[PDB]
Amino acid sequence: RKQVSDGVAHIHASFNNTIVTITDRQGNALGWATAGGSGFRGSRKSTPFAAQVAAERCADAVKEYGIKNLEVMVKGPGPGRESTIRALNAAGFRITNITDVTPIPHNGCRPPKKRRV
Amino acid sequence: PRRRVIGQRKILPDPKFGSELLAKFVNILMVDGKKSTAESIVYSALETLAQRSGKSELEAFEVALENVRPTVEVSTYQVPVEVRPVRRNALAMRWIVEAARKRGDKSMALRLANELSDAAENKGTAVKKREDVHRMAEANKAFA
Amino acid sequence: IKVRENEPFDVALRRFKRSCEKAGVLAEVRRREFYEKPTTERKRAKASAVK
RNA sequence: GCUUGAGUCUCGUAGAGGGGGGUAGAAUUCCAGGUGUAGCGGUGAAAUGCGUAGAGAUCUGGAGGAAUACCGGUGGCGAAGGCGGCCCCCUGGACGAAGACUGACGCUCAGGUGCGAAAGCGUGGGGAGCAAACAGGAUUAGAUACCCUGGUAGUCCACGCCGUAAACGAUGUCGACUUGGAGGUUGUGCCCUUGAGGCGUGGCUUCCGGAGCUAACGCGUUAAGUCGACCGCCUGGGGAGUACGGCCGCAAGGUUAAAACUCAAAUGAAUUGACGGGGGCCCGCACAAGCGGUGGAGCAUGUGGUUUAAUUCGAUGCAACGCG
Numbered sequence A: 001r002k003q004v005s006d007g008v009a010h011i012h013a014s015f016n017n018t019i020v021t022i023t024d025r026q027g028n029a030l031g032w033a034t035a036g037g038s039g040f041r042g043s044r045k046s047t048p049f050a051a052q053v054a055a056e057r058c059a060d061a062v063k064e065y066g067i068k069n070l071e072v073m074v075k076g077p078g079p080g081r082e083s084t085i086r087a088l089n090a091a092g093f094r095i096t097n098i099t100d101v102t103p104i105p106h107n108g109c110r111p112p113k114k115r116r117v
Numbered sequence B: 001p002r003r004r005v006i007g008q009r010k011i012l013p014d015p016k017f018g019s020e021l022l023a024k025f026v027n028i029l030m031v032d033g034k035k036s037t038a039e040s041i042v043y044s045a046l047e048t049l050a051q052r053s054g055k056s057e058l059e060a061f062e063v064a065l066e067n068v069r070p071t072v073e074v075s076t077y078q079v080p081v082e083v084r085p086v087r088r089n090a091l092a093m094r095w096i097v098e099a100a101r102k103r104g105d106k107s108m109a110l111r112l113a114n115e116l117s118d119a120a121e122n123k124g125t126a127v128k129k130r131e132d133v134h135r136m137a138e139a140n141k142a143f144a
Numbered sequence C: 001i002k003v004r005e006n007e008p009f010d011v012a013l014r015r016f017k018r019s020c021e022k023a024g025v026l027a028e029v030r031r032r033e034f035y036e037k038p039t040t041e042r043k044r045a046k047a048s049a050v051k
Numbered sequence D: 001g002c003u004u005g006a007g008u009c010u011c012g013u014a015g016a017g018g019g020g021g022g023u024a025g026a027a028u029u030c031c032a033g034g035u036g037u038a039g040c041g042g043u044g045a046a047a048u049g050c051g052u053a054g055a056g057a058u059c060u061g062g063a064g065g066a067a068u069a070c071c072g073g074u075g076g077c078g079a080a081g082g083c084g085g086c087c088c089c090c091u092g093g094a095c096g097a098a099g100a101c102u103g104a105c106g107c108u109c110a111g112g113u114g115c116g117a118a119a120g121c122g123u124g125g126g127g128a129g130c131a132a133a134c135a136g137g138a139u140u141a142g143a144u145a146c147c148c149u150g151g152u153a154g155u156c157c158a159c160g161c162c163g164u165a166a167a168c169g170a171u172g173u174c175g176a177c178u179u180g181g182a183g184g185u186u187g188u189g190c191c192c193u194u195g196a197g198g199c200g201u202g203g204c205u206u207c208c209g210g211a212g213c214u215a216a217c218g219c220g221u222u223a224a225g226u227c228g229a230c231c232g233c234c235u236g237g238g239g240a241g242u243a244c245g246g247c248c249g250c251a252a253g254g255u256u257a258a259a260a261c262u263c264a265a266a267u268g269a270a271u272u273g274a275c276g277g278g279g280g281c282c283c284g285c286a287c288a289a290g291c292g293g294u295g296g297a298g299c300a301u302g303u304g305g306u307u308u309a310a311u312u313c314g315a316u317g318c319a320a321c322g323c324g
Helices: A048-059 A082-088 B020-029 B035-053 B058-066 B085-102 B108-120 B126-139 C037-048
Strands: A006-013 A018-024 A029-034 A069-075 A094-100
Touching (some): A006 A082, A029 A048, A048 A082, A069 A082, A082 A094, B020 B035, B020 B058, B035 B058, B035 B108, B058 B085, B058 B108, B085 B108, B085 B126, B108 B126
Parallel strands (some): A069 A094
Antiparallel strands (some): A006 A018, A018 A029
């Protein structure tokens, strides 16, 4: 179906969850998979293992497109992200670019207070 | 074990088959320092195991014990960790013997002969203990 | 940031991420505007950097 | 009168000094649209919350507000509060080089006047994020908290008020003298520059230390050393920086400022120890790895209690309870 043959893997690692979205070069999503949607709810959805099985599961569900090349775009910090791109070249993809696209303000908005734990 | 790294003591092999593996199996089975009784039970049970399966003695034992050896075992985290080989077959024998004590047959040689026979086609209780351990270490795979 | 595919490679192993953004810069902008704790955190950081 | 104090002029230097105006780029939120699909978010774990009315992720376009990553530095500037993108306009101070000029014009300062973070107040705007109050979810014995999800005043602008802070180098201002070392920053002169040069002379500043001082801790040419001038303030702890009165303030409150009564201490620095849900290193059947027990049953024996005429006395966390 529609046979795009090149895409972008936007991986959005945060501290609590990694969410991998495989799209095309136009930016239209072709299929996604989160670490929290792969079993292991909770303290286990923020691990490199959960991110890699999230990326394995996002490599599935884009078989209908015949993607061979993809760029990787990485957001946020997280226990994910590093393992995530590994799972992508464990799934036959030719990984072309690895950009880190974490949003950094140039002293913009005030961050929240928190955490007197 | 706080300080002292240790050696280990050498057990005498089995007086019928020369197997230190099976010698540790009669030590796992032994209660109250009665070794003669336990080796009688092991010779009877493995003798009917060799007669039933028709293979041989300690390769029927080695198959029936090969089906129950654990692969890996498990804030409070239950991490999976790879079992050492001596601990591997030590756990194998402890689960066979414990499950054989759980059974409801007549004699201990029949309970353990039927438990090793149920472990030869891996359908007994010790294999459910191994699958249980492997479900715990398989569910919690996310910690390494 | 960006690293182009090499002609004969298995792992890109980009270190672009490490030299700048991940470790410090995003973990710093998770928490409060002070003016006060940074003046003392930098004061004791430059007072610790001593022989 | 005089120039060694103070000041003026010439030429430059560095600077987040101030006020006004403009602009730029990242990011957050919102709105509209494309793809796409079952979760997202959150936590120690959860739930509230958002989501098949299509969220989150992702791309495009727009709006708006605030703050200005990197440079960034015990770096700089300012009397202090404080001041951080870039550009323009108006403007204050400092420092340096040589020379000229005035000629003690100086120092401090009670009352007085001005400036004075943040929160707060008034009027009018603005309102993206954050967030007192507030609401819900948790946690808990309770939880009017810490944690989570939302969230209003406020934070932002204009003008006025307030007038305070651990407004702190807890160190008033001005001047003079008194061994050193390593830096930072900003001027400048000289000398093969023949480096990542050399040698000097100023301004501000950081760390360590000598004499000296100090209760000690420490300060140590930027003094808490050695002196001089003027000011401010102190006189045991509490009551109390409170009440009354005055002045100020829209208010909140600010400032000035007692007494009765009560205690024989309150305090500073340092020492020894003990302790810590502080840190480092180390041990023991301490935990872990195992095996067998106890707690359940009947009996033995000891104890507490009860009973009794008496149920002899003693032992009572560990280290009393088949103990004397």
